[PDB]
Amino acid sequence: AESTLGAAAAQSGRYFGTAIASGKLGDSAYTTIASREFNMVTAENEMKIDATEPQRGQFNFSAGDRVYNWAVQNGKQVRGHTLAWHSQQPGWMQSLSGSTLRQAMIDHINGVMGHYKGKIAQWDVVNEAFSDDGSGGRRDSNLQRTGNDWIEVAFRTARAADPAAKLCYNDYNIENWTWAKTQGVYNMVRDFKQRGVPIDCVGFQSHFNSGSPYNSNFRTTLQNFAALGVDVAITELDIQGASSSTYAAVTNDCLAVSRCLGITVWGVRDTDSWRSGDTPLLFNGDGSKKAAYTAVLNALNGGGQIKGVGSGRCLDVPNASTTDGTQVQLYDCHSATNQQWTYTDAGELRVYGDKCLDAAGTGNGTKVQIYSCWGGDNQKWRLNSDGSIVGVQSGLCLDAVGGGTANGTLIQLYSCSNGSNQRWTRT
Amino acid sequence: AESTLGAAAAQSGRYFGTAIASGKLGDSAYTTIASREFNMVTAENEMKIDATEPQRGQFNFSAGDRVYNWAVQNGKQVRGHTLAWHSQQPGWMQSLSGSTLRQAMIDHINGVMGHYKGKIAQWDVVNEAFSDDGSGGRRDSNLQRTGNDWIEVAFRTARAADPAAKLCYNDYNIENWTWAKTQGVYNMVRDFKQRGVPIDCVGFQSHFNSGSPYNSNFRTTLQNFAALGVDVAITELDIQGASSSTYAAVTNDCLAVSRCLGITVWGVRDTDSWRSGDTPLLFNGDGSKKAAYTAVLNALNGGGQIKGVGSGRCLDVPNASTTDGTQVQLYDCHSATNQQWTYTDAGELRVYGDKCLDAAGTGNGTKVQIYSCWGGDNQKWRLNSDGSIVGVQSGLCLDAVGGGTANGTLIQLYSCSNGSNQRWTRT
């Protein structure tokens, strides 16, 4: 299929997943989207060390199993997250070191993987072991202090516990090839593969924002790692601002690499995000598809003026008016500024640089006009591959009033119908 | 003093006020902004009918007085809101009709005004009496059903209760001259003035959004009413999206009409707004001045490339790259898209049409770069009259590193100090 992210990824043998919080499994708006769009699930916190072994030797899999069962029952594979980590260790584990800690780490791995043996597709065996200090060296943690070979030991232990699972090393800020951290990790995987240490994949968290932005050399990093013989996976993707171009770029980078298994966005709706303030996901709080959703789906499915298919006329701001509240119309196409629209990464259709195509409401018959740009959802649009233009807030289509084709025919929001007065062609 | 909204408005004999909610007076973030910027206060809910006369004949002024006391302790005047209205009537009053309702209306006016006799600058005597149906006629309410003269009676009653107060009729959607509602109200005021009914002002709520956008003909509406011999006031100003241009325009309309007493914005911070989702105010949830704050301030005080005054060099995007994360620098001025910056209504500095000047942080030394435009506060800037450019989120100034005047000097955020390397001029 090609209507949902998971189905469209499946076409090239990949998956499109999300992080699931068991706390939201009761929320129907949440499960409706999650069940429909994704085919891979990562438990947000449920499979962490603190959650699965609250007390030494005493394993708890209630929350983890809840997420796991939901996933399998809804046709999704699962990524285990995570076995050894310097962060979120239960207090009992923080009170350990040396041989005792090393042993605890091993017991925890066997305990968790044993419970889930044969039913987890990929495991993030070791998470965030490298430093951010620009050294490209490991981070000083109680685990690292037990011995530099702990990472190798963890992977060897993991392989033994469940040989059916793909074992990955997971980390953030290893996306830009030029970074000292990316090099540090690369060198470790290189070494591991040379010495036969069991590592099947490298997960790239992909938490992009203005502090650590996406760079096109990400495709290069993915290709260099894949050239070592490991699979690569985009594991916790979210982009500050949810730029349509950046989401499409990351998606195409995965598609360009045969060893890229798939992509997992870190959450369902912006409000579910650990960084909701950055509106970094594909669905907004209302559960509606953002402009980025369409950019991602179109990328997975394969690879100026706005002219009405039914009329052969262009979207025009009457007499080149700049006043807010001016309703747009159809008019003979001509090379004028009032007929030139720019679709931004935020999902706006700008004219005159700072005026936005705006919906004055959410119902059928709603007037489509220009108004100062401010980032409201009523000024965000989705340009579908079928030629329809859907408002993000309303979910309705741009519609030439009454099917009119003459100059002066007005534009409104209306139930999408695949009609020609709802079909547009960017030129 | 031209540094605060109130003091700046006072330079033209006007005031700049806000709506104060008593429940927020214990929040110093809230009161710090409120006591500093405004010189006129309207109680948001505390002087309403239900709040002041909970039971028939039993007046309660505890809440209203908390708003009043604060206002006078902090040197502000007060607008009373509101004495007669079809909305938010206490239960006992909603049950009344005919002459019984009519007398209760009179009793309420005498009761509230008597308590605040001589302490209130203006009173919104009757509020929202006109219909939105397009007839330009009266709204059907229990009050209007007591007889058409109820408005006249409310004014005659109020004048006798406190002859020291300016008595206003207050309504919304009466800003655009062309609307039936506006002209319906104009005719009522004209009738009153010619029959000697005591009315001193008309309050235009001015709640502007895309369904009811600001229109430049607002200035003729204001002039039309002032010509009737009544003072005019903008009473509950808020603009969906808080466009700098629209906010400056409304401000200039009041400044152009000598009988325009002042402007009251409906709330302090965006999160204090009854329409917070529209981010319609002058301070964001953090208590930071938005781009619109600057536009209003500049308008009250009398009111391409970006050259650093200290270097005589332009803000430049290295090699004309469009990669997120590219830090900006100073460079010999010249016509190049990578030197052309567009300041938008939202407060962004766009380059290449969809890249925005971006602060990757809030502290001193923070790097200033370009990043896909998305609307974050770290991409919002205030262009002050003194030549500085302040980041909305950080409160820091664009600072040419080390005072560097040479090509290649990097731009960073740093504490404002009005040095030459922090003053910029546009072209």
Side-chain angles (χ1 to χ4, degrees):
Chain A
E2 36 77 50
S3 292
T4 60
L5 302 174
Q11 302 182 107
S12 62
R14 289 173 179 90
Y15 63 76
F16 206 98
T18 191
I20 287 298
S22 64
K24 293 159 179 293
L25 288 177
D27 181 352
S28 80
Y30 178 87
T31 64
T32 287
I33 298 164
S35 199
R36 181 185 78 231
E37 304 290 341
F38 312 103
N39 55 9
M40 183 61 96
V41 168
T42 301
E44 213 186 331
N45 303 285
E46 298 78 9
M47 288 185 191
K48 273 160 178 180
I49 308 173
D50 60 341
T52 52
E53 197 179 353
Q55 278 310 309
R56 187 184 192 157
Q58 312 173 51
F59 290 92
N60 189 332
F61 299 110
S62 287
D65 282 3
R66 210 180 325 282
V67 174
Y68 173 78
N69 293 324
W70 181 86
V72 179
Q73 289 299 342
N74 286 280
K76 295 108 180 64
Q77 287 177 297
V78 179
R79 297 192 77 265
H81 180 78
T82 179
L83 304 170
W85 192 16
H86 69 281
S87 184
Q88 287 185 251
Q89 296 181 350
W92 68 256
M93 182 172 272
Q94 305 177 7
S95 298
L96 294 185
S97 62
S99 66
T100 314
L101 181 53
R102 178 64 59 95
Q103 193 53 49
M105 174 198 299
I106 298 172
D107 294 326
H108 178 83
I109 291 171
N110 284 321
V112 185
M113 292 186 77
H115 178 65
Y116 290 111
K117 193 200 309 294
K119 49 201 187 175
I120 295 297
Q122 306 169 29
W123 264 107
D124 279 342
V125 183
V126 175
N127 204 45
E128 306 167 2
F130 284 70
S131 181
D132 291 312
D133 67 6
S135 69
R138 301 189 180 192
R139 75 162 69 243
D140 178 54
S141 79
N142 61 336
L143 296 174
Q144 179 56 30
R145 278 186 277 99
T146 71
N148 196 77
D149 65 324
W150 73 273
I151 298 183
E152 179 187 336
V153 169
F155 280 97
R156 290 191 180 281
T157 301
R159 172 67 87 225
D162 182 2
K166 278 185 176 170
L167 313 182
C168 310
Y169 171 72
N170 195 49
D171 221 338
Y172 59 92
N173 287 172
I174 59 162
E175 296 84 20
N176 189 320
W177 180 251
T178 64
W179 292 345
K181 192 175 169 172
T182 311
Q183 291 311 301
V185 174
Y186 177 82
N187 287 325
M188 176 189 80
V189 174
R190 233 275 233 64
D191 175 44
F192 280 11
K193 294 301 283 184
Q194 280 171 347
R195 304 192 294 96
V197 177
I199 191 181
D200 306 305
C201 37
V202 179
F204 295 82
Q205 285 183 28
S206 298
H207 292 305
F208 299 122
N209 59 41
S210 66
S212 293
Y214 162 86
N215 188 286
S216 57
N217 71 25
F218 182 36
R219 187 180 290 195
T220 302
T221 301
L222 293 181
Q223 292 169 330
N224 287 348
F225 277 86
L228 292 182
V230 289
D231 292 321
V232 297
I234 293 164
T235 63
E236 312 182 6
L237 176 72
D238 46 37
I239 306 164
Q240 178 191 53
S243 158
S244 293
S245 285
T246 309
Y247 256 111
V250 171
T251 302
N252 282 317
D253 285 344
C254 181
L255 297 175
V257 180
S258 44
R259 288 269 215 156
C260 186
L261 305 174
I263 302 176
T264 291
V265 290
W266 209 239
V268 179
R269 303 160 303 191
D270 289 334
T271 52
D272 301 311
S273 172
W274 64 321
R275 292 176 179 186
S276 55
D278 287 329
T279 62
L281 297 171
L282 305 178
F283 297 86
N284 60 31
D286 295 340
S288 51
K289 300 172 180 179
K290 297 163 72 178
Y293 175 93
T294 301
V296 175
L297 184 74
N298 293 344
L300 289 169
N301 273 324
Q305 299 173 139
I306 295 173
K307 197 178 185 187
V309 175
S311 57
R313 288 177 158 96
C314 290
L315 204 54
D316 178 278
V317 184
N319 312 307
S321 173
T322 48
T323 47
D324 292 347
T326 301
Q327 182 166 13
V328 298
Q329 66 175 2
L330 281 181
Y331 198 85
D332 297 321
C333 301
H334 54 272
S335 328
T337 57
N338 64 313
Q339 283 198 2
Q340 290 154 7
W341 305 85
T342 297
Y343 186 45
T344 69
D345 275 340
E348 309 150 319
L349 278 168
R350 294 183 173 242
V351 62
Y352 312 129
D354 206 21
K355 292 298 171 179
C356 280
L357 193 62
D358 179 279
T362 50
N364 288 306
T366 288
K367 161 185 188 172
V368 172
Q369 52 182 24
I370 65 163
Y371 187 86
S372 297
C373 295
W374 67 275
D377 278 330
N378 61 307
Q379 301 187 324
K380 305 296 178 63
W381 306 89
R382 286 189 283 124
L383 306 205
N384 293 324
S385 56
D386 65 357
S388 60
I389 297 177
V390 189
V392 171
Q393 185 183 67
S394 68
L396 270 14
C397 278
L398 277 192
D399 177 279
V401 176
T405 56
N407 289 329
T409 293
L410 302 175
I411 306 300
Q412 66 179 352
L413 281 194
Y414 205 90
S415 297
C416 298
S417 61
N418 190 63
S420 60
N421 64 313
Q422 297 205 351
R423 279 189 290 238
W424 308 92
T425 192
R426 289 204 63 114
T427 67
Chain B
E2 68 178 289
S3 59
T4 54
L5 298 168
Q11 292 186 157
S12 76
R14 293 173 174 81
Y15 60 74
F16 208 100
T18 194
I20 290 297
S22 58
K24 301 174 181 299
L25 289 175
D27 177 355
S28 48
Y30 179 82
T31 56
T32 283
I33 294 182
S35 50
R36 187 187 73 228
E37 304 287 347
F38 306 104
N39 58 3
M40 178 64 83
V41 164
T42 301
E44 193 179 9
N45 295 289
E46 300 82 358
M47 289 182 191
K48 290 183 174 172
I49 306 170
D50 55 357
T52 47
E53 198 181 358
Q55 281 290 306
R56 190 173 193 168
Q58 295 175 191
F59 293 92
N60 191 321
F61 305 109
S62 59
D65 289 0
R66 279 184 249 128
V67 175
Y68 178 80
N69 289 342
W70 185 83
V72 306
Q73 171 90 5
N74 287 291
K76 292 109 170 56
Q77 284 186 282
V78 182
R79 292 196 83 250
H81 177 83
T82 177
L83 302 161
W85 189 20
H86 68 288
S87 186
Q88 289 183 245
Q89 284 184 0
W92 66 265
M93 182 179 287
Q94 295 171 9
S95 296
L96 309 180
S97 57
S99 57
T100 318
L101 204 213
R102 175 65 70 88
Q103 190 57 46
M105 179 190 81
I106 291 164
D107 288 342
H108 183 66
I109 291 169
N110 286 330
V112 182
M113 286 186 93
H115 178 82
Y116 288 115
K117 199 171 170 297
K119 299 187 284 202
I120 302 299
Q122 306 175 26
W123 264 108
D124 282 327
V125 174
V126 175
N127 200 46
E128 303 169 11
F130 281 72
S131 192
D132 286 318
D133 72 347
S135 65
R138 299 286 183 84
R139 170 188 300 279
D140 177 34
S141 68
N142 52 0
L143 297 166
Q144 174 65 19
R145 297 181 216 116
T146 61
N148 210 72
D149 63 316
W150 75 274
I151 299 180
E152 168 177 354
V153 171
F155 279 97
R156 290 186 183 290
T157 303
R159 172 69 90 230
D162 186 1
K166 274 191 167 61
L167 314 182
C168 315
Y169 171 68
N170 188 55
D171 216 335
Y172 59 93
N173 284 176
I174 53 162
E175 298 78 24
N176 189 318
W177 178 257
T178 64
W179 292 336
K181 195 173 181 180
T182 310
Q183 299 181 8
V185 173
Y186 177 82
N187 286 332
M188 180 187 87
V189 182
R190 180 186 172 165
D191 173 56
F192 282 9
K193 297 308 288 186
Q194 67 162 123
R195 293 193 294 103
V197 176
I199 175 159
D200 307 312
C201 33
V202 177
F204 299 80
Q205 293 185 14
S206 302
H207 292 296
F208 301 118
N209 53 45
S210 75
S212 172
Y214 158 86
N215 186 298
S216 62
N217 77 21
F218 180 40
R219 188 185 291 195
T220 79
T221 300
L222 291 175
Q223 292 168 348
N224 288 348
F225 280 84
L228 288 178
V230 294
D231 289 325
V232 298
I234 295 177
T235 58
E236 312 183 9
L237 182 60
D238 56 27
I239 303 175
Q240 172 183 63
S243 154
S244 304
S245 288
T246 310
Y247 253 111
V250 179
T251 297
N252 282 326
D253 284 339
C254 182
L255 293 179
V257 183
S258 48
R259 277 187 171 261
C260 187
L261 303 175
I263 305 173
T264 285
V265 285
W266 209 234
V268 183
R269 299 159 307 188
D270 279 352
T271 44
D272 300 313
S273 174
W274 65 312
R275 294 175 171 192
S276 50
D278 290 325
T279 63
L281 296 172
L282 303 173
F283 294 86
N284 65 17
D286 303 329
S288 295
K289 299 177 183 181
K290 299 164 61 170
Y293 173 93
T294 290
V296 170
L297 188 67
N298 288 358
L300 289 162
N301 279 330
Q305 295 159 293
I306 293 172
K307 275 190 185 171
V309 302
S311 65
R313 295 202 187 311
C314 287
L315 195 67
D316 183 272
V317 180
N319 307 116
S321 49
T322 49
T323 299
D324 293 340
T326 305
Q327 183 162 14
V328 296
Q329 59 172 11
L330 282 177
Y331 197 79
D332 300 315
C333 296
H334 57 259
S335 185
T337 44
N338 66 312
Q339 288 206 336
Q340 309 309 123
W341 302 85
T342 300
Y343 189 49
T344 72
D345 269 352
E348 306 159 311
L349 280 170
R350 298 186 162 230
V351 62
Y352 311 128
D354 209 14
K355 290 298 175 174
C356 275
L357 196 65
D358 181 282
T362 50
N364 284 270
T366 287
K367 167 184 172 183
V368 176
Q369 63 198 6
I370 64 161
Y371 187 88
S372 310
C373 292
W374 68 280
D377 286 330
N378 60 309
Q379 299 197 325
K380 259 66 174 288
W381 305 90
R382 292 191 280 117
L383 307 198
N384 299 319
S385 57
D386 64 90
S388 57
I389 295 169
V390 184
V392 165
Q393 187 183 66
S394 53
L396 276 25
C397 282
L398 269 199
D399 177 286
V401 184
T405 53
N407 284 318
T409 298
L410 300 183
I411 311 299
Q412 51 158 19
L413 286 179
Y414 207 68
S415 300
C416 300
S417 60
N418 211 225
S420 45
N421 70 323
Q422 285 188 355
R423 292 202 305 274
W424 312 82
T425 192
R426 289 221 291 171
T427 68

